[PDB]
Structure formats: C-alpha cells, structure tokens
Design a protein around this ligand. Structure first.
Ligand SMILES: O=C(O)/C=C/c1ccc(O)c(O)c1
Length: 360
C-alpha cells in the first residue's frame, strides 16, 4: 500500500451546539490547497456531533478504511482528546483543532493549532491587573476545557495577585445557569472569567448581566466569532476576549508574518459569506493546511505517501521545520512544545456598539 494522493481525515462538529465552531472550520476547507508537491490531497470530512465516541470511531475509520497520512480535529476539547488517543495508538500525525491537555501519552503524534490556554490567560490576567481587578470569579464547563482554564486562572492568576472568590461549573448542554449565577453575584467579584465556547459562552454573559452583575466579564478564545455578539446582544458590551490575530489582519504591520495569510483567508471567506464573517475557528483549519504545505514537501523527499515511513517523516518534519507562518500565529513545534506559539499569536478584543474592536 503506497499512493499518489495524500490522505487527510478531518473530524469536526457540524451538528449540535458546537456546529458554531465546526461549520466555519469545514467551510474554510474550500480555500486550502488541493495539491501539495503535485500530489493531490484527498480530504475526507466526517461529523462527530461533539461526541468523543463518534470522534473515536471517525478517527479509527480514517486510519483503517482511508489509510490517512494525517488526521485533524475535532472542534471542541472532549472529542479532540479522543482523536489524540487514536492517533497516538495508530501512529498517525494529528493536528488538533481545539485546545487539549498534552500529556506524555498524547505528545508524540499530536500538535495543536489553537492558542494554548496559558498564552491566552496571560493577556487576560494582565488586563485585569491594569484595570484594578483584585477579586475574580469563575464559571466554566464541568469538563477538560473548563478545567484547563480554571487551573490556569488559579496558577497564573494567584501568582500575579488575583484572588479567586467563587468557582461554578455547568454542562455544555445546559439551558439555564441560574443557580451558578446567583452564587457568583452573591460573591460579587470585581471580574468574572467565563470558561466556555461558542453558543454556551453567551449563556453566562446574558445571565450574569440580566441578574444585575456590573463587574468586568472576560471570555476565552473559544468565544471568538461574530455569533457571540449575535446571541448576547447588548450584554456583550465591554466584554474582554482573547483572540487570534486573524480577527484583525488589517490592524497588523506589513512586517507581521501573520498578515498575508490572514488576508488570504479572510478575503476568501468574506467574499463568500460577507463582511465580518471571519472567525477564530475558520483560521484553525486553514492554518493546519499551511502547516501541511511546509511539512509534506519535506516528507516527500524521503518517503512515499500511504506508508508508515511517510507518517514518521511528517512527525519529524513538524519539529524540524521552524517558523511556519499562518493566520493565527507563527508555529515552531518541538518534542515538548506541541503548540509551538508565542506572542505573535494573540490579541485582546472588546465589543463596542456591537462590533469587535482591538484593545490597543
Ligand atoms: O469547547 C471547547 O472545548 C473549546 C473550544 C475552543 C477553544 C479555543 C479555540 O481556538 C477553539 O477553536 C475551540
């Protein structure tokens, strides 16, 4: 088994609540390379509905039925963890499209495109300090994503002089967070960090304001699309939100390596879907292909697509190829840094009169 095409399996969430993340990821595939080194790319896209069991099945199908050289996904963290388990057992390179906890068992075959939590937390906690915030409450998912954030707030947050005074959790599918909001408003912190994503991110935003909270609200990069503003409406005003720089390529210097790729994606996306349809999420799948454009030609020098040797050559190329410019950042993976990002990979956003504005 050795082939002319390079086979890429993608599992993303295009049904259910997390479709707010996976649909732009799928849509961005219209604008990525169709061939690398003259080899056509065979891209198989499967929905997982956000479910780790479905993601596990899809990922294994890509290995066994499709003989994939690279697997990508998923849209949210629990199925992403599942994909990483399969990829590490099968020895297939995996580009994660949601943040996930890198452990030793996942590090060999997995890299991640979204900004790591600590890089995003740093920009949020610094703004807190600069705005005279001393006490902070947290509301987030009762799963690995909500844990990543809470654990960072506690470690980074306390170390630069923030006090956590309240912690509440909710489940992704929950339609109400009334109970949690009552306890947060009762604690009355200066600021609240919401550890959520997509549509669910807007539920604490609206409930907190409707319940009369008047402190600062901070949101994570999981919330970084126009849909958050659509859902939260006036309650989104003054929110502070971590995002990738693809949200504002126009505001970047021509010397930013992120600028040309951001403009390429946004011009394509917004030509089809309209002004200000850009998102954090479209950029991740687009950027995964930018990485492949760098690493696949290296692997082609020494190995045939469809072979374990090719999979191994991609794995080694991910670490040997430095400074891969993409829309969301400049990636330099190492054997221990599976995200490969630095300060060029984030900006801080606020919302003013219903639009995103960069906090300068
Ligand atoms: O819901 C989650 O599990 C996290 C989702 C998430 C968070 C940050 C990103 O950049 C992204 O594409 C997805």
């Amino acid at each position: 088994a050795e082939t002319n095409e390079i086979t890429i399996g993608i599992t993303v969430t295009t049904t259910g609540p997390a479709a707010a993340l996976g649909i732009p990821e799928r849509n961005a595939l219209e604008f990525v390379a169709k061939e690398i080194g003259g080899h056509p790319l065979k891209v198989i896209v499967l929905d997982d509905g956000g479910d780790p069991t479905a993601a596990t099945t899809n990922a294994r199908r890509f290995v066994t039925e499709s003989k994939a050289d690279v697997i990508m996904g998923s849209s949210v963290t629990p199925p992403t963890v599942a994909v990483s388990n399969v990829a590490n057992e099968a020895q297939v390179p995996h580009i994660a499209l949601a943040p996930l906890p890198i452990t030793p068992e996942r590090a060999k075959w997995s890299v991640a495109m979204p900004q790591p939590i600590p890089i995003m937390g740093k920009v949020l906690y610094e703004h807190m300090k600069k705005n005279n915030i001393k006490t902070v409450g947290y509301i987030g998912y009762s799963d690995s994503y909500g844990d990543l954030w809470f654990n960072d707030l506690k470690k980074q947050g306390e170390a630069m002089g923030l006090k956590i005074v309240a912690e509440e959790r909710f489940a992704r599918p929950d339609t109400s967070v009334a109970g949690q909001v009552l306890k947060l408003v009762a604690a009355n912190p200066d600021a609240i960090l919401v550890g959520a994503s997509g549509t669910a991110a807007a539920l604490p935003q609206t409930s907190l304001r409707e319940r009369g909270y008047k402190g600062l609200i901070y949101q994570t990069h999981g919330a970084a699309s126009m849909d958050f503003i659509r859902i939260a409406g006036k309650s989104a005003e003054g929110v502070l939100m971590a995002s990738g720089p693809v949200m504002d390529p126009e505001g970047q210097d021509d010397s930013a390596l992120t600028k040309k790729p951001g403009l390429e994606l946004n011009t394509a996306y917004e030509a089809k879907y309209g002004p200000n349809s850009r998102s954090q999420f479209a950029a991740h799948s687009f950027d995964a292909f930018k990485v492949l454009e760098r690493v696949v030609p290296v692997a082609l020098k020494t190995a045939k697509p469809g072979t374990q040797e090719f999979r191994e050559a991609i794995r080694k190329a991910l670490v040997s190829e430095k400074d891969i410019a993409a829309s969301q950042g400049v990636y330099s993976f190492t054997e221990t840094d599976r995200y490969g990002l630095d300060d060029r990979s984030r900006i801080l956003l606020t919302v003013k009169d219903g639009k995103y504005v960069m906090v300068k």
